[PDB]
Each structure stands twice: as C-alpha cells, then as structure tokens.
Amino acid sequence: IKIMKSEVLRVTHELQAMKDKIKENSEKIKVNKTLPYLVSNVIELLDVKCAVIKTSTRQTYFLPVIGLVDAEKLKPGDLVGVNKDSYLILETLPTEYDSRVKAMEVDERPTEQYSDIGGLDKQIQELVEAIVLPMNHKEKFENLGIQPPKGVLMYGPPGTGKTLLARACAAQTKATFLKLAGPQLVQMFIGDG
Amino acid sequence: KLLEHKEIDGRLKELREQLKELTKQYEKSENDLKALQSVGQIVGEVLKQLTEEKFIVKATNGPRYVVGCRRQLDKSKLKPGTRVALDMTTLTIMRYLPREVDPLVYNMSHEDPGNVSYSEIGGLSEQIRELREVIELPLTNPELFQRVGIIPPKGCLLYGPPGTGKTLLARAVASQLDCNFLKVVSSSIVDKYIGESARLIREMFNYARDHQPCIIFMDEIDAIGGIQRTLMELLNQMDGFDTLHRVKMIMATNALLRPGRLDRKIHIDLPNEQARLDILKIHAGPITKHGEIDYEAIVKLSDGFNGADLRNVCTEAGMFAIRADHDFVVQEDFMKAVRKVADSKKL
Amino acid sequence: CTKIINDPKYIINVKQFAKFVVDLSDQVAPTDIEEGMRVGVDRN
Ligand SMILES: Nc1ncnc2c1ncn2[C@@H]1O[C@H](COP(=O)(O)OP(=O)(O)OP(=O)(O)O)[C@@H](O)[C@H]1O
Ligand SMILES: Nc1ncnc2c1ncn2[C@@H]1O[C@H](COP(=O)(O)OP(=O)(O)O)[C@@H](O)[C@H]1O
Numbered sequence: 001i002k003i004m005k006s007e008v009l010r011v012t013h014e015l016q017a018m019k020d021k022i023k024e025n026s027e028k029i030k031v032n033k034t035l036p037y038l039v040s041n042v043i044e045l046l047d048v049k050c051a052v053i054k055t056s057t058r059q060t061y062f063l064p065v066i067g068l069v070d071a072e073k074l075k076p077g078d079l080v081g082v083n084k085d086s087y088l089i090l091e092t093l094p095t096e097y098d099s100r101v102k103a104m105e106v107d108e109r110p111t112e113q114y115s116d117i118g119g120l121d122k123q124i125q126e127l128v129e130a131i132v133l134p135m136n137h138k139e140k141f142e143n144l145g146i147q148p149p150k151g152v153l154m155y156g157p158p159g160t161g162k163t164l165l166a167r168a169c170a171a172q173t174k175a176t177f178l179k180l181a182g183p184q185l186v187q188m189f190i191g192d193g
Numbered sequence: 194k195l196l197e198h199k200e201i202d203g204r205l206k207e208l209r210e211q212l213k214e215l216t217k218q219y220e221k222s223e224n225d226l227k228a229l230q231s232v233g234q235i236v237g238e239v240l241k242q243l244t245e246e247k248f249i250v251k252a253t254n255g256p257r258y259v260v261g262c263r264r265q266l267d268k269s270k271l272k273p274g275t276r277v278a279l280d281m282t283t284l285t286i287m288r289y290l291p292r293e294v295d296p297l298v299y300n301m302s303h304e305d306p307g308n309v310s311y312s313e314i315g316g317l318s319e320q321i322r323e324l325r326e327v328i329e330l331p332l333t334n335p336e337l338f339q340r341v342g343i344i345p346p347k348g349c350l351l352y353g354p355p356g357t358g359k360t361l362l363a364r365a366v367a368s369q370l371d372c373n374f375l376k377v378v379s380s381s382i383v384d385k386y387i388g389e390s391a392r393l394i395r396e397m398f399n400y401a402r403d404h405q406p407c408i409i410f411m412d413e414i415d416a417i418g419g420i421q422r423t424l425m426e427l428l429n430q431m432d433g434f435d436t437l438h439r440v441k442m443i444m445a446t447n448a449l450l451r452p453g454r455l456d457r458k459i460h461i462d463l464p465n466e467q468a469r470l471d472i473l474k475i476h477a478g479p480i481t482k483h484g485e486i487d488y489e490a491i492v493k494l495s496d497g498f499n500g501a502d503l504r505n506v507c508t509e510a511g512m513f514a515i516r517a518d519h520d521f522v523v524q525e526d527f528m529k530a531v532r533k534v535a536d537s538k539k540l
Numbered sequence: 541c542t543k544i545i546n547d548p549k550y551i552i553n554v555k556q557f558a559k560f561v562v563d564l565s566d567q568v569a570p571t572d573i574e575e576g577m578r579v580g581v582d583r584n
C-alpha cells in the first residue's frame with residue numbers, strides 16, 4: 001500500500017521534470033539547427049560513429065561525430081544537410097533528382113507501333129525479348145534459371161532504325177522510359193556528369 | 194483487495210518502464226547536444242615528412258600546408274600518401290584514416306579466393322595438368338628452385354582460339370590459392386609505347402605481395418595499345434627481379450619465345466567433340482531441363498568450335514523455351530538451338 | 541529551387557557555389573515558388 005503513494009508521487013515528479021527538460025533540450029536543438037543546411041554527401045561511413053562528408057562546395061571533411069541523426073540509418077552516397085561552418089550533419093535529406101533527370105523521363109509517350117518498322121523483324125524480336133520480356137515476366141525467367149542480359153547495345157550505320165526502334169519500344173511498353181543522350185552527361189563542373 | 198494491488202503494480206511497472214525509456218531518450222538528446230559542439234576536420238594526404246614535428250599535407254581540394262602532428266599520434270602511421278584529418282583552425286594533423294578505394298583499381302585489386310573445380314571448365318584436362326605443372330612447383334617449393342640456381346619461372350603462353358576458356362584455365366588453377374587473380378586485359382601495362390608504367394606496372398606486384406599469392410594474368414596482349422621494343426623492355430624490366438610471393442603471368446591470346454621473355458607455350462586445342470559433350474553438360478546444368486534430355490548427338494551436329502558458342506546455345510535453347518510456358522527444354526529444342534547457332538556463326 | 545520539402549524547406553542550387561536547404565522570407569508566399577524555377581537568395 002506504501003508503493004501507491006511513494007512510487008506514484010516520485011514517478012510523476014520525475015515524469016514532469018524529465019518532460020520539461022526534454023522540451024528544453026528539443027527547443028535548444030531546434031533553435032540551434034540553423035536552417036541554411038549546406039547540402040552534402042556521405043562518401044563513406046567508418047567506425048570510431050564517424051563520417052567523411054563531401055560538401056556541395058567540392059570539399060570533403062571528416063566528422064568526429066555523426067551529428068543529429070543516427071549512424072545506422074546512413075550509408076555512402078546519402079544526401080545530408082550539414083552546417084554551413086561546423087559542417088556537422090543536421091538532418092538527412094530525401095533522394096533529390098536534378099531537373100534534367102526529371103525532364104529525362106518520358107511523359108508524352110510517343111506513339112510508334114512495331115508495324116512502322118520494316119526490315120527489322122529479328123532485331124525487334126531480340127529487343128523485345130531482352131528488354132521487355134524479362135521485365136513483365138521476371139519470375140519465370142528465374143524459373144528456367146536463365147540470366148536475362150542487363151543491357152542492349154543497338155549499333156549500326158546511321159538511318160538503320162536504332163532510335164526508331166527505341167521510340168517504338170517506349171511506345172508499346174508500360175515501363176517508365178528514361179531517354180537521354182551522350183552529350184547530356186557532359187558538364188563543365190567536375191563530377192556533374 | 195489483492196487484485197486491486199496487482200493491477201496497481203501493473204500500472205506502476207508500466208510507469209517505471211516509461212520513465213526508463215524516457216531516460217534513454219534523454220540520454221540520446223544529451224549525446225547529440227554534446228555532439229553539436231564538434232566541428233569538422235579537413236581531409237588531406239601527407240605528401241612528405243619535413244621533420245619529426247613538421248608535415249606536408251595537401252587538402253583534397255585545397256592548397257598544400259606545412260603542418261605538425263597533434264601529440265599522441267604514432268608518427269610512423271603517417272607515411273607519404275596516408276589520409277589524415279587536419280584540424281580546421283590550427284591545421285594540425287589530428288587522426289589518420291584508411292585510404293578511399295581509388296577508381297582505376299576495380300579489376301586490379303579485387304580478390305577472388307574462390308574454389309572453382311576443374312569440372313566447371315570441362316574438356317581441358319591436359320591444359321589444366323600443364324598449368325598445374327607450371328604454377329604449383331614454383332609456388333609450393335621454391336627452395337629446390339633456389340637450390341638448382343634458376344630463380345625465375347615467369348613467362349607462360351596459352352595461344353589458341355579466342356574465348357575458348359582461357360580465363361577459366363587460370364580460374365581452374367584457383368583450386369589451390371591464387372586469391373587476388375587480377376585481370377588487366379590488353380590495357381594499363383604498356384599503352385602503345387610506355388604510357389602505363391610504375392603506377393601501372395608496379396602496383397600489380399605491390400597489391401599481390403601485400404596479400405596471398407595471385408596471378409597478374411595480363412590477357413590478350415595482342416591488343417595492347419590497340420612499340421615492340423617497348424614490350425621487349427617491359428618484360429625484361431625488374432618484374433622478374435623481385436617476383437614477389439610467387440605471382441605468375443597467365444597471358445592468353447594468339448626471338449620472343451626464349452626463356453626470360455616467354456616460358457612454355459601451349460596451344461589451346463580446338464574443343465574436341467568428346468570434350469564438347471562435357472562443355473555442353475557443365476554449361477547446361479543450371480538451366481531447368483527434363484529427364485528425356487540427352488547431350489549425345491548435339492556435339493555431333495554442333496561443331497561450332499567455341500566454348501562461348503556452347504554457353505550461348507545453352508542460353509538460346511532456354512530463349513526458345515521462353516515462347517510457350519515450357520519450364521524445361523526438350524531434345525528437339527536443343528537441336529533447334531544448335532542448328533540455329535552453329536549455322537548463324539557462319540554469318 | 542531544385543526540390544521542395546514538405547514549415548516547407550527548399551533545396552536551392554547556387555549555380556556552382558553550393559546546394560542549400562533554405563526557407564522563403566516573409567515577403568513571398570509558398571504558392572509563388574515552384575520546383576525548378578530560379579529565385580534570388582540573400583548572401584548571408
Ligand atoms: N527499318 C526501318 N523501317 C521503317 N522506317 C525506318 C527504318 N529505318 C529507318 N527508318 C526511318 O528513317 C529515319 C531514320 O531515323 P532513326 O531515328 O531510325 O535513325 P537511327 O537508326 O537511330 O540512326 P541515327 O542515330 O544515325 O540517326 C526515321 O524517320 C525512321 O522512321
Ligand atoms: N570449355 C568451356 N567450358 C565452360 N565454359 C566455357 C568454355 N569455354 C568458354 N567458356 C565460357 O567463356 C567465358 C570465358 O571466355 P574467355 O575464354 O575468358 O574469353 P577471352 O579468352 O577472350 O577472355 C566464360 O564465361 C565461360 O562460361
């Protein structure tokens with residue numbers, strides 16, 4: 001019967017003291033998290049809990065402590081907003097895609113049936129069986145235990161129908177086509193490509 | 194009244210555990226608050242040792258600074274080339290860091306201490322016997338080699354048809370040791386005249402020596418840089434001088450044949466049909482098949498004379514099986530695949 | 541503003557200088573700023 005009064009009083013007192021002290025600590029952390037958040041990437045994670053961060057200013061700093069996030073929920077390559085000057089990680093950032101990458105996605109879905117391609121029946125069959133057939137089947141390809149090839153290189157003289165076949169494949173597939181060009185992935189800034 | 198006290202104890206224990214979890218969360222908050230005061234440290238490479246207490250460090254994308262160590266750091270760990278973390282204000286070396294894996298080195302530094310049986314590479318018993326006779330004796334017991342006097346067994350040559358299993362030959366020998374097993378095919382050792390050297394001739398022998406024995410295994414040197422005297426000089430350089438930790442060269446391609454320049458040369462025999470059956474067996478293993486299958490007349494009709502031909506016909510029989518729900522490939526299907534490929538290869 | 545974050549946060553690309561996570565000043569409203577458009581930011 002003593003445990004009622006003694007324990008309830010003590011535990012509620014510790015609850016309230018710890019609660020307002022947690023609110024104080026959280027307020028201090030929030031006010032200390034200066035918003036600018038210089039964006040940086042974790043190039044590697046190493047044990048002492050410590051990280052090597054390459055900032056968007058093209059310079060890499062070692063961090064004696066991780067910061068305000070958890071080291072377990074991190075890996076190489078993640079986007080983290082570090083402090084402008086302290087360079088300490090303040091929060092993790094969701095996967096960010098450049099405007100060029102988003103524009104790279106096919107949204108108009110050009111309409112080109114395979115009937116518009118003449119003289120390439122074997123080539124169309126190879127492309128559809130290497131790029132589309134392993135896509136919407138998958139599990140049965142594993143059932144036969146046969147490895148579907150990872151990539152296809154369409155090569156030949158100009159005007160043979162390479163880009164035409166690619167456009168037709170984008171037309172007659174439900175996959176999210178991601179078109180691009182070689183010169184697109186060439187930029188002034190180091191590491192931009 | 195006992196049940197009332199028991200529900201009381203249940204609630205009070207819940208409150209105690211809640212306080213414990215709150216205490217853990219408060220400790221994490223205090224830990225991150227303490228972590229807040231920490232500041233980053235610039236990353237650089239120690240280029241040179243000026244004195245005991247003076248160092249030369251190059252910031253990754255900064256200038257070169259003359260700096261000194263902190264104090265309680267083992268100065269021997271700071272060789273030229275090591276990665277260190279300078280303080281951001283006094284620029285003193287604070288701690289050392291592992292190197293960061295470099296680009297170029299992806300097939301030059303990867304280790305494969307695997308166990309690939311000679312059954313996987315089928316139909317080449319004589320070649321694997323010869324490879325063992327060449328590599329095992331120097332690696333196993335060099336004491337007899339230094340006793341007789343002849344130190345260097347380097348050289349070797351496996352000319353034959355292209356892509357018939359040259360890599361598997363050095364992979365078959367991987368049954369005993371041969372961990373690093375680098376593949377630097379037609380590149381990064383000569384580059385026409387000299388272009389790749391030292392940093393592209395010596396790191397082979399360094400990363401082999403700092404680990405278990407391996408095979409630089411340069412490949413298809415008929416396409417290096419795409420000059421002869423340069424190759425003559427490169428093979429006659431100090432490569433055979435040190436011969437670190439019994440690492441051999443397993444060149445594969447098509448007075449260069451004397452000792453010290455090229456050791457025993459073996460012609461990879463054209464895949465015999467009686468060996469074609471073994472190749473087709475060990476390639477057609479993983480693909481899901483049926484009981485009535487039989488690999489006897491295929492090699493009779495399949496005279497494509499290439500191992501990759503066998504791999505591709507194994508894949509192409511399955512590719513035929515993709516049409517219709519066939520989870521297994523029938524003998525007629527293999528026959529169709531070979532009568533397709535062995536004739537398509539002619540074009 | 542390369543990416544919008546939802547107090548909303550905004551990731552900005554200062555050409556070659558750097559990438560920052562910033563917020564709008566009180567002068568502009570969140571509706572005006574859209575993803576991918578170029579905006580002016582103070583130097584501090
Ligand atoms: N086999 C074909 N059947 C029908 N139309 C074809 C065929 N080959 C080319 N064309 C047409 O001719 C033009 C050739 O352009 P296409 O984009 O196909 O070129 P390509 O093969 O990708 O080569 P390049 O990259 O050199 O321009 C297109 O307008 C296409 O419609
Ligand atoms: N006799 C064989 N047994 C099994 N696989 C073989 C055989 N011959 C060739 N291969 C296949 O060929 C590939 C290796 O080709 P390789 O001979 O290394 O070409 P290259 O000599 O041009 O490097 C391997 O993936 C292997 O599956």
Ligand SMILES: [Mg+2]
Nearest residue numbers: 159162163164
């Ligand atoms: Mg084109």
